[PDB]
């Protein structure tokens, strides 16, 4: 059911997504251990993910949340990096995509900082890095991140290190 | 998958030490996110 449509780099939508990706890179406390050492990306492609069933699943839940929160979905656009990116775009997010040992319990984690999500592309802690070179800081291998529409509703605030 | 804290739909992880970190978020229902854009990229080696 999923179709991927390439965006042109001339398209304003490409440019705004690129800008969110590049502008939310930061340095990490691991010195680059998990995600690599970098200040910016080479964006090779941006595709719009089109699936009617998954979109309807999302908007159905979004309406439920909205109605429980004074008609406010608290929708955000957030990054997600995962080894399961191919499953997610075809079948949607589910229990298999959760970070079981995350600090906030077993759920599906998203980041404002693209570079945070980059830490998880090759697995938790960067796993063993890229499949080809076993390098968490590989500058050759193509990586993939999702930029996702997320309904937060009423969000529980946890202050944390 | 765990559950949202009662009376909530998500958790927000507010950075309390690293002043440059942005927030992280957790949802407990897959239907609360849609993977809208697939971005293919390389990280770049600093000069
Ligand atoms: O993008 C994320 C993906 C994931 C993640 C974690 C485990 C697995 Cl198995 C897949 C993705 O964790 C994060 C934690 C904090 C902020 C963002 C992320
Ligand atoms: Zn590699």
The CATH number of the domain holding residue A116 is 3.90.228.10
The answer to whether B14 and B23 are in contact (CB under 8 A) is yes
Domains located in chain B, CATH noted:
1-47 (6.20.320.10)
Structure tokens at B33: 């996110």
The structure was resolved experimentally with X-ray
Pairing of strands B33-43, A143-151: antiparallel
Structure tokens at A42: 């080479």
Q: Do A92 and B31 touch (CB under 8 A)?
A: yes
For A117, the closest chain B residue by CA position comes to B24
Which residue range is the domain that position A107 belongs to? 1-161
Q: Do B36 and A49 touch (CB under 8 A)?
A: yes
A70's CB contacts (< 8 A; 6+ apart) are none
With beta carbons under 8 A apart, name residues in chain A contacting B19.
Answer: none
d(CA A6, CA A129): 27
Using CA atoms of A59, A61, A65, A68 in order, give the dihedral in degrees to the nearest 10: 110
Number of domains composing chain A: 1
d(CA A96, CA A80): 14
Helix, strand, or coil (residue A61): helix
The separation between the first and the last C-alpha atoms of chain B, rounded to the nearest angstrom, is 42
d(CA A101, CA A161): 16
């Amino acid at each position: 059911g999923t179709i991927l449509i390439d965006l042109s780099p001339d398209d304003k939508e490409f440019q705004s997504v690129e800008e969110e990706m590049q502008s939310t890179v930061r340095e990490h406390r691991d010195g680059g251990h998990a995600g690599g050492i970098f200040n910016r990306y080479n964006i090779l492609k941006i595709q719009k993910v089109c699936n009617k069933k998954l979109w309807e699943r999302y908007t159905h839940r979004r309406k439920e949340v909205s109605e429980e929160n004074h008609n406010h979905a608290n929708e955000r656009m957030l990054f997600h990096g995962s080894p399961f990116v191919n499953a997610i775009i075809h079948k949607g997010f589910d229990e298999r995509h959760a970070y079981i040992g995350g600090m906030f319990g077993a759920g599906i984690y998203f980041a404002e900082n693209s570079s945070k999500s980059n830490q998880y592309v090759y697995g938790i802690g960067g796993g063993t890095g890229c499949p080809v070179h076993k390098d968490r800081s590989c500058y050759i291998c193509h990586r993939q991140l999702l930029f996702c529409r997320v309904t937060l509703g009423k969000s529980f605030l946890q202050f944390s290190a | 998958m765990a559950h949202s804290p009662p009376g909530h739909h998500s958790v927000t992880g507010r950075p309390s030490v690293n002043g440059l970190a942005l927030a992280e978020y957790v949802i407990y229902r897959g239907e609360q996110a849609y993977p809208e854009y697939l971005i293919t990229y390389q990280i770049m080696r600093p000069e």
